[PDB]
Amino acid sequence: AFTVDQMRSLMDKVTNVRNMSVIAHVDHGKSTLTDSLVQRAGIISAGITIKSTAISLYSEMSDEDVKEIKQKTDGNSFLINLIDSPGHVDFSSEVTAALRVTDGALVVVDTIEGVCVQTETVLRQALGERIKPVVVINKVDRALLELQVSKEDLYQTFARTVESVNVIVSTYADEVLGDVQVYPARGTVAFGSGLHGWAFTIRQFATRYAKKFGVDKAKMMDRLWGDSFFNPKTKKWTNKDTDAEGKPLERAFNMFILDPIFRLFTAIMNFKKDEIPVLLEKLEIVLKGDEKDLEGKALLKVVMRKFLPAADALLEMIVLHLPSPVTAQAYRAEQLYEGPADDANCIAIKNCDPKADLMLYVSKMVPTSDKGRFYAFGRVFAGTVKSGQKVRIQGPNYVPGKKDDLFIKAIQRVVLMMGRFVEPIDDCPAGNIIGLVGIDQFLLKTGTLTTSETAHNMKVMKFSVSPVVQVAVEVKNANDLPKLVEGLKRLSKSDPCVLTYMSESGEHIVAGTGELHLEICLQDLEHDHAGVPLKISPPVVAYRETVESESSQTALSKSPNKHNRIYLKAEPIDEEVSLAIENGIINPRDDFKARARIMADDYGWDVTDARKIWCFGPDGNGPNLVIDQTKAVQYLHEIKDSVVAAFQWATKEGPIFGEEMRSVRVNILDVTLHADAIHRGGGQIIPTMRRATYAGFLLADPKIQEPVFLVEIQCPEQAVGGIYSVLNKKRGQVVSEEQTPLFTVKAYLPVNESFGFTGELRQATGGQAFPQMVFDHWSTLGSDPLDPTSKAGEIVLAARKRHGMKEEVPGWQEYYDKL
Ligand SMILES: CO[C@H]1[C@@H](O)[C@H](O)[C@H](OC[C@@]23C[C@@H]4[C@H](C)CC[C@H]4[C@@]4(C=O)C[C@@H]2CC(C(C)C)[C@@]34C(=O)O)O[C@@H]1C
Ligand SMILES: Nc1nc2c(ncn2[C@@H]2O[C@H](COP(=O)(O)OP(=O)(O)O)[C@@H](O)[C@H]2O)c(=O)[nH]1
Ligand SMILES: [Mg+2]
């Protein structure tokens, strides 16, 4: 319990300050460990409440300990800011913001589960902020009580967990920081049980056995970990796990640190009442009062807390190893600062100079009980902030030249953020964490306060600006459609970054910048904008139905009358030609002569075939054609309209599963009609032509084509590797890798492989890659559309079931009428 004066005095010696947080996978004990720290060293002031965002700890080290600190120290008192970090670990920017205001981290790892993805994710983000890590292998009690594990097994488990961790560190830590790996012998690894309240470092044991083995602890802690053995027979320390005779030697870690602990557990839990007093006496543990009566776990919990208080182990690593702001801001300055590295503000950050202009980073806005008011939480990197001080509030889009996001206003009050409470203070110098009241309106989320007109903004969060996340929206009650269509308009108008359009398959699509953005949009659309139950789902992907080769044999079909017959074959239309039709070089209404000259001279077509195209389809202009190759059919001219109409019908609804055809050419080889027009009416010939077309189609090695996106991704070099990793998992294909900004990888990504892509990409690039996608072209899947188990077939079977059609695709024989 300190007074505002004591706190302010503590905050002057930033050399003795430690800004850090606890990194842990859910359930690994992050909470009970901080409760332990708070109960042991928490600080409290000697009716407005807030959400606990940070806690202050106080610690004193012995004069000898302080000498061991490899960094500028002023006295034996230390102020530790334990900063709260979100629990969402998706490489989110909320987490990055929280870490940004810290310099060191206490990483919690489970004895049994070891390092899990969640752990790797926050640690990776932390390393990206040049944060120094220190580890605590937690839940050790489980291995002793539940699993009955042996000393060497426990050792091995510890060593493997430490290795897993230093793999992540060696991979993502900036080489400029040197070796930021963790070493038990150097005291950067603690072992214990946050629930039982005990933990230790090799250092503490070295201190305990140094003055006992007649050796300095520097020598002792190297010997208390890894391959160091003490042969009681020779009384010597060696690095060989066997003696001269070759007999097995027990590792020093097991023999001097684990065994005493193992013996305490075994004796106390088995009620060996004549073995416990001696063991406790030897370890110099003293039970007082009612404690002398405890037994079992109760006695154990109490004995271990006295023998190795947890908080003590943790505070030791924090003070001795985690960097102070002075130490850290020296190598973190440039990243933190967007401006010039030679800039006056950057230098003030490197020096953690309290007399320079203000450079205060706003980490986030915290909820208070002061009727809808949010206090700004952050860290003073340069200068000192004062109550009633005129400062310059610069949002995420501010630039020294423009007046965007700029907001000059006085800071109403500077408060200490102590748990759920606040404490008004007059000022706060560089190196400290602090809360600002009165910044609510001008800043929401991150920002940057300065007292210099030149001041550049501190590292801002990079956010997506492309509608890469999209879903299909539909009313649960058909009659509501009008409100939905209206709601989308209202939604679009209110949000610049939101996009809505109708898909090729007839679904309303709503797309957002990121998953979160899209979620707000859908919530607002459903609740306000449209105000009606909406149904959300992955947009249906549209496909095309084409042929890979000519009909293996003439297609023959007759009319209902059985009097008329059409003979035809289908063949592929070249992509360049389909494209030419789709894009305007070859047009439905152009003069057939000039068009045929182009198709023949420039595209390899036979000019007679070209001069004889009867129509394009579907809709009279699609990339499918009917060419007349008949020789002496008498009443040909009279059935033309029926044939054309049937084609518009056939190309609009393919026989594979009802999708439109594309790149399909149909050659009419011959037609036999009835002499009297009354048996050659459209009602007779339209079905014939459609039936024959479907047959020629199916006889031409049918295939479906899928939509393919052109995806453009901006990101930093070291992250590019994740891009290729994801793409390869999604039938992707790289197109171009260009560039002294970032990189930009361009690739083709099948549309049916893009649902959730944005998520898997941030996950594979540590949230550093930013996707952009636009429809590019159609691609023919080589697999059999009629084989329910091939890639194409699965897609066809899913669409058929979804539409209530029979599963089996009718084969060509179903449309062929034998002579
Ligand atoms: C500017 O934003 C763009 C990009 O997001 C992208 O080009 C997107 O693509 C939409 C699709 C466009 C394709 C062409 C019209 C023909 C095939 C169409 C698609 C159907 O599967 C592929 C993509 C993704 C779609 C379905 C799944 C919605 C498309 C559609 O509109 O149905 O369109 C919007 C407007
Ligand atoms: N056996 C054991 N359980 C623990 C230990 N520390 C925490 N737990 C338990 O693990 C669960 C999650 O703990 P908590 O501190 O909330 O973890 P967090 O959510 O990651 O912060 C709770 O049921 C705890 O009682 C420990 O050292 N040993
Ligand atoms: Mg917790």
Swiss-Prot record:
The modification N6,N6-dimethyllysine is found at residues 489, 593. This is Elongation factor 2. GO terms for cellular component: cytosol; ribonucleoprotein complex. The lineage of its organism: Eukaryota, Fungi, Dikarya, Ascomycota, Saccharomycotina. It comes from the Eukaryota. Belongs to the TRAFAC class translation factor GTPase superfamily. Classic translation factor GTPase family. EF-G/EF-2 subfamily. There is a cross-link at residue 818 (Glycyl lysine isopeptide (Lys-Gly) (interchain with G-Cter in ubiquitin)). It comes from Saccharomyces cerevisiae (strain ATCC 204508 / S288c). It is an enzyme of class 3 (hydrolase). Binds to 80S ribosomes. Actively translating ribosomes show mutually exclusive binding of eIF5a (HYP2 or ANB1) and EFT1/eEF2. Interacts with the 40S ribosomal subunit protein RPL9A; the interaction is direct. Interacts with the 60S ribosomal subunit proteins RPL12A; the interaction is direct. Interacts with RPS23A; the interaction is direct. Interacts with 18S rRNA; the interaction is direct. Interacts with 25S rRNA; the interaction is direct. Interacts with RPL0. Interacts with STM1; promoting ribosome inactivation. SMART domains: EFG_C, EFG_IV. The modification Diphthamide is found at residue 679. Present with 160782 molecules/cell in log phase SD medium. There are 2 genes for eEF2 in yeast. It is found in: Cytoplasm. Keywords: Cytoplasm, Elongation factor, GTP-binding, Hydrolase, Isopeptide bond, Methylation, Nucleotide-binding, Phosphoprotein, Protein biosynthesis, RNA-binding, rRNA-binding, Ubl conjugation. GO terms for molecular function: GTP binding; GTPase activity; identical protein binding; protein-folding chaperone binding; ribosome binding; rRNA binding; translation elongation factor activity. (Microbial infection) Diphthamide can be ADP-ribosylated by diphtheria toxin and by Pseudomonas exotoxin A, thus abolishing its function. The gene is EFT1.
